[PDB]
Symmetry: D2
Subunit: 328 residues, 4 copies
Amino acid sequence: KPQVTILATGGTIAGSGESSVKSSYSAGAVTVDKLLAAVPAINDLATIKGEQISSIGSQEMTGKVWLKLAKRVNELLAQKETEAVIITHGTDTMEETAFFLNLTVKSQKPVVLVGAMRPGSSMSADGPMNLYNAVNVAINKASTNKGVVIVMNDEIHAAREATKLNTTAVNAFASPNTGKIGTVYYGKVEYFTQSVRPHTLASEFDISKIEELPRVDILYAHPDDTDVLVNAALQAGAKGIIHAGMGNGNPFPLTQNALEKAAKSGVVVARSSRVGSGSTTQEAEVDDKKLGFVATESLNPQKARVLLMLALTKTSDREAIQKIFSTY
Amino acid sequence: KPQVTILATGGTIAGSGESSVKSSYSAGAVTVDKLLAAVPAINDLATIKGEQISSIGSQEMTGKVWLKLAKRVNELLAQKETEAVIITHGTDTMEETAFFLNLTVKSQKPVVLVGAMRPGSSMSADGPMNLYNAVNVAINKASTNKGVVIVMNDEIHAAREATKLNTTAVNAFASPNTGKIGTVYYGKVEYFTQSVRPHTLASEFDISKIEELPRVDILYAHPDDTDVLVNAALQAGAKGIIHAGMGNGNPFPLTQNALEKAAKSGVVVARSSRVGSGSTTQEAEVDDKKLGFVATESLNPQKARVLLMLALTKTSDREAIQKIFSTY
Amino acid sequence: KPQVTILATGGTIAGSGESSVKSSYSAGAVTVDKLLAAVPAINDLATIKGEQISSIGSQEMTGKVWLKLAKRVNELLAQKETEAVIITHGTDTMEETAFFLNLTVKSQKPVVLVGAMRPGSSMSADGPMNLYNAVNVAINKASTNKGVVIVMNDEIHAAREATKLNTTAVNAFASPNTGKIGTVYYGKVEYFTQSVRPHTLASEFDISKIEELPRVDILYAHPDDTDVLVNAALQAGAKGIIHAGMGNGNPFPLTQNALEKAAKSGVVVARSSRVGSGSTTQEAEVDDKKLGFVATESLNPQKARVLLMLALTKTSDREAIQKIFSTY
Amino acid sequence: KPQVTILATGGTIAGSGESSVKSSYSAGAVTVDKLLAAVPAINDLATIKGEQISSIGSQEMTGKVWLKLAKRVNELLAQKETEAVIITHGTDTMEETAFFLNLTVKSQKPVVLVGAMRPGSSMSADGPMNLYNAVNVAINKASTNKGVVIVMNDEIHAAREATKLNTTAVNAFASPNTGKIGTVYYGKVEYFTQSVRPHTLASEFDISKIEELPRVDILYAHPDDTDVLVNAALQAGAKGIIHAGMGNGNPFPLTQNALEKAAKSGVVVARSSRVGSGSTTQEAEVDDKKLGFVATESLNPQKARVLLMLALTKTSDREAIQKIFSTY
Ligand SMILES: N[C@@H](CC(=O)O)C(=O)O
Ligand SMILES: N[C@@H](CC(=O)O)C(=O)O
Ligand SMILES: N[C@@H](CC(=O)O)C(=O)O
Ligand SMILES: N[C@@H](CC(=O)O)C(=O)O
């Protein structure tokens, strides 16, 4: 039987509420051991080792825990005996952790993130099936070299493309610019596409000696916008700013002016969008070259932040960072 | 023939680029008169009066223009001769303008917002058809008392529900929590649903004597989040803050602490979500009553901002504002 | 406590498989009584009476069972003590039964259909939450006069608009031409829109004296299509044919010829589409008036069949049936 | 400049209506030469040769034309000078043609299918931009070995996954089980994923010596279904039947009995679904091995028909055909 390690971080999958029919609960309340005992059929599939990396709601995730988790995954997958890793994780920021790992894990062995939109104490809790299916994906031969994936609601999503697109639904995960790469239905795994953007072994990023990640803020654009948040981010030592712009990455004028100043001072300014999907494109209404900005293209603000944080471990050059957004 | 007024504000619909096959352009470059001449068939449908309210990209919209526009629409619709108003507008913040008008226009006569994702100079420009269809919706008997609507890509969307969900696509408008209320296909108008949330005549808000709207900022949540933007918004005189939270409206703990302080100081803190769709609910992981926050429920951050701005014209009470978010 | 009757028909909600982690199962295997005992919290909400109408997979539904079910619902809702009815039903044809009831139930009291995409024996079975939520929708004051609704996956869908759009997903139900009318999240019910198309009390149809429904066949269009299936449907006594056409209701020429003959012989031919969404429109590429056909507009083939079956209980006139498709 | 051949077959892209503001038109009314002259900017990109293969609405497509087209594409791509082929085609059955070519074209050079939902005579006609973008995709270096693609509405869809999902919308194309593999925005081409199912050079099918394809019918399932259409298809010499079943490929019992007889007589019976998306799976409610049926898995009925037609050129064995549906 293949050997897999499950790394637990917390989340609603390890969550608990007082009533099976009320929505109120606490995430990251249940230990890995207790979680794995709820789904005994996984032991028929693999030899499982569990480990507790953290016990938090993913809304409390930090770069420190990301670094810890990436180093540990890399350690585990370097072992001959370990065929894959599964990470149990809150859904709120699962897309950030997955995207981070997709660019920092140096292996072609599967890494699967899995969560739940309902706590295990809930009626019709989704976690048990999601976990069963994640183990099936982790051990499947076709899961090699697919990059880091999210397995939720019978779907396999590529880390670069995945996002949580709804606040409460069990089907909240989507890949709005592509779609899922595969399915897993009562454990039966099928892939239909793969990412052609570089990941994992092909990624230039390496965090093995990094203790702290660069600071990157995200700003939310709107009419009658301001300059005070740009200024506050600068004052707090931001090395990069993601601007979640109106439509195709458009800023309000006051804000644009403040961002132009930030970019002159050596803070990388990257244009994304608040809309939800599509590319924040070059050569539309904003002259990025003149203003000193990067266009994030087909990402979203929160994943663009992760990519910019990694870019900043190597460079702050505008062109070099544009190339990184145009590659990964 | 019915008489309709077209109020122009600018946008890509009145936009212009150097090449029909390149994506670069300037919004709000074409006058209303020139715009109406591109689509002569509208004169077969109605007697059209055009009026220039502004000439800007909608990313430059301000409350001052919203107020000017709302007062002018109310004036026009009070006239016996005027059957409807159409507003030509940039797509980037069309949803904010429409939502604002939906709560401030005191008439049951149709108000239709229309724009274009491609400028009129482009190959396969969408503006002409969108405008033709908007005039048909404006004059349709079933359009009465539907509230303010957006007409884009052969669809009719309710202002409360509509959002721009894609950066570039002609089909970027959606109503992710409901769906379109009707269709318009080569001028043929059909409605299938209507909003059951109060709007227009049934709205408690009145801006007739308002010259400036309260300041409301929006913050974008993520892992390793900060308190400095909350603090900067407070220091700039924010009367309300929309927090675009992780998943179902969840803040990072440092940020939560700063928001709790903001709310004690008398600044209304309203929880929305960065995810895109769904309700930011009460009684999930965040104890809104204990912390002093409002849950925005089934809105998004930019529309929640508009509602909170209107609410703040008369109250900063947490419970009264919750009731407003739970009603409109 | 409000009194509600649950009418069980079978389906995967009342289904059973040998293993909680295998996809294989039998629908309609579990009695109503056993089903209701799996979700004891419903008794806190209402006084429940259960009844067994049938015990089948919805793929075995027949017009006979529809008639039985509609007469029984009408009987129950005529009682002063009965506040609503819930029907437990297979998901495969739930949209047909719901649409049928939406046009034959003569009450404004709620009628809620509910099912499950996973049997109750499955890990992470959806039925229990779906049922809990359906009871909440049934007793909610705002559910009056909404027409017949489907409650699945925390969503409330209008019967006219709902369809099963995926083979296996718990979120398989959608309303592709509108969207859901409301939500129900751990029992909390909210409506955002309502249908403006006539239903229930406003429907002209009455099945109280009908023992058998007219025969209507559905044909699937494609390139290199044939005339032999039209001819076979005619020979078997079809009173109507739904043609699920290519794109916007387009037939292949051989088939068109056979359909033209059918329509001359007095068999109503109604044009729908195989695509999934949108209106099958008048005055596009097919000259319906010349050929003797009806355009089904914004329905799908299977719901168009139900509507045509009901239309045929009153008339076979082409114009009158066009008007019915243009109204309901 | 790269040399490309444009093969015209007809469709709404080569369509014409009497009015730019009315929906009525005739497809396949405009010659290739006239079509290419509407979009002169394509001559800046490539050296274009046009060729008229047919002049029809795609609803009139036949296997004879498919064969003619496939042989001609293979001929053209065998030429050293020809870098790609673009096929202008009606949208109604573009997905069938693309899928067929995806299994029969023995080259890695790009083949792009393109159409339009509005005729060139219409206001805001989509054809010009779609064609411009198709030429850019055809000449892009990353388009090699992606298989046959559909380019519509700024999107690039894999032939195996694409379908027309709406009757009238310019954005009617989708890939509901995956999503688009790339984008093309004012000619700028980007790929994000690729199919991992075998196509083109890797396909086992060869039609070079085929003059006529096997007959395969499609049936549309519903409640109170019949056996007469199965019987009529058998009597007309069907070699295969696609059954568009209820939910996850479920037949009505009378129909099932007739299909079981068809399969005993040596006619291949393949189970698909009427629902629109998802896999019609093995080992759910239907025992395919016992009954003698194939499960079509993640296709739809019209594409399953194409695959079964190709399969039938060499085998009618149930297990061999299952393996084909489970591979391609
Ligand atoms: N707040 C939770 C939500 C979930 O897991 O569904 C988390 O992200 O940890
Ligand atoms: N920036 C433009 C975008 C558009 O109209 O499509 C505007 O909103 O004015
Ligand atoms: N075949 C089942 C499927 C389900 O209920 O999910 C039925 O419709 O009865
Ligand atoms: N009936 C037309 C529809 C279109 O091209 O849009 C065709 O498929 O040829």
